């Protein structure tokens, strides 16, 4: 994918936005222990929607968070996971589905299971992603029976993670710059080598054209002569 | 529809043995103190049915916490799981599991056990897939072959590799951030090792390319030497041909002029 959160943040640094909008990080401590909500904001709409769209997530719209429905959060979650975590959900499901492992008598109609398993795998993927962002509470309901509270909670954790990425970006350029240096060096070497080889072969072809047509012309006029005179 | 021959008792015996084996192999009896035996599967209680359904679905979706009214949630779970035989089962029957329609309930429990086993297999498959398609990039990037629109693909692969490293760093760092201790040195040194290996690979590639360009320069000079020799030879032969043809034409023209003049002298008479 041509996009990411890292390169987009760099491009934003180069622009006048500064750090791609937002207020850096958030870490809520909690001693309500009679209650317990994990360490991240539940920052509300607008702030949430603005941050989501700042990360180049066009599907983010206020009408979805406060009134979510199935098949909408699914696309957004796939998009977020593939951007931050740099994977392909479709490739993973395809890998799970493939065959030449099991083989079994009553499994000649695995279709009745197949669909369900894909669902589960999707869900479980999200689980781990959200298990890495302070929430242990993804379950099926978030995907297929969404409610605004859990949606805003998960998205708040997500935006907090994104802001953390932005903050810690400075430790990364020491590597991005060297990567780009080496890649640009390779590209320049390849361009030079291609130019040299193309130049030589074009010169050879042009000379061949010259001399072939020279031979043709000499034969042309010699034979045109000798046909009239003999 | 439900093609399963649920009412057959040999089929039921097989299903009950499989369910018992799965629950024992995964310690249902220990995690929940309610024990399980095949006789129970033949003569189920309502509470034991609820416990088994809960245990199975939580093995299938740990993040879910029960709520509501289990009659209202079992249907919704099956609806979200798109249980293909959902339309064949009525919700009210959930109230009395051990009654007339116990066969469908035992059938869905077998469905869930099979789904659990297959889910575990799928997760192992995807984990191995991740570890393998991580190493596919490096193994591809250390083979010499091809040049077709792919050098761009090579740079893309390098970028993706480094991006993976960075994502690992960020995820671990955010783990430390949420766990309010802030020790980023371990994440940093793991990132440093990864990027060092990246640098070694890409610099090996760069050195290969530099040597290849130098060898190309040598070869092109050697070939242009021969090209120059051939061009000089062709020009030489062309000039010799031009002078010879010009001389032959001049001689023919002069002799024909002489003959024509002599013929004029002869005709005047």
Numbering used by the authors:
A (entry chain B): 254 to 270, 290 to 305, 1002 to 1153, 1407 to 1451
B (entry chain A): 114 to 318, 621 to 684
Sentences from the paper on this structure:
The bridge between centromere-associated kinetochore assemblies and spindle microtubules is the Ndc80 complex (Ndc80c), a heterotetramer, conserved from yeast to mammals, with globular elements at both ends of an approximately 600 Å long, largely α-helical coiled-coil shaft. Closely paired calponin homology (CH) domains of Ndc80 and Nuf2 at one end, augmented by a flexible, N-terminal extension of Ndc80, form a microtubule-attachment module. The coiled-coil shaft of Ndc80 : Nuf2 has two specializations—a kink or hinge at about 160 Å from the globular end and a so-called ‘loop’ at about 240 Å. At least three interactions involve subunits of the DASH/Dam1 complex (Dam1c, consisting of Ask1, Dad1, Dad2, Dad3, Dad4, Dam1, Duo1, Hsk3, Spc19 and Spc34), which coordinates end-on attachment of multiple Ndc80c rods around the splayed plus end of a kinetochore microtubule.
The predicted structure of the docked segment suggested that a fusion construct of part of the Dam1 C terminus (residues 252–305) with the Nuf2 N terminus, combined with a deletion of residues between the two conserved stretches (residues 271–289), might ensure high local concentration and increase the likelihood of obtaining informative crystals. We therefore made the inferred Ndc80 : Dam1-Nuf2 fusion construct as part of the dwarf-Ndc80c, expressed and purified the recombinant protein, and obtained crystals in space group P3212 (a = b = 130.0 Å, c = 216.3 Å). The Spc24-Scp25 component had dissociated during crystallization, and only the Ndc80 : Dam1-Nuf2 heterodimer was present in the crystals. Dam1 binds Ndc80 : Nuf2 with an α-helical segment, which rests in a cleft between the coiled-coil and the globular head domains, and an extended segment, which runs along the N terminus of Nuf2, but also contacts Ndc80. A salt bridge between Dam1 Arg299 and Ndc80 Asp295, both conserved across budding yeasts, anchors the C-terminal extended segment of the Dam1 fragment. The Dam1 sequence in the structure also includes three serines (residues 257, 265 and 292), the first and third conserved among budding yeasts and the second largely so, that are potential Ipl1 targets for regulating Ndc80c binding. The structure suggests that phosphorylation of serines 257 and 265 would substantially weaken the contact. The side chain of Ser257 is close to conserved Ndc80 glutamate 276 and its phosphorylation would result in electrostatic repulsion. We observed that density for the Dam1 segment fused to the second copy of the Ndc80 : Nuf2 head in the asymmetric unit was much weaker than the first, and its appearance was of insufficient clarity to build a molecular model. Thus, the crystal packing prevented uniform ordering of the Dam1 segment at position 2.
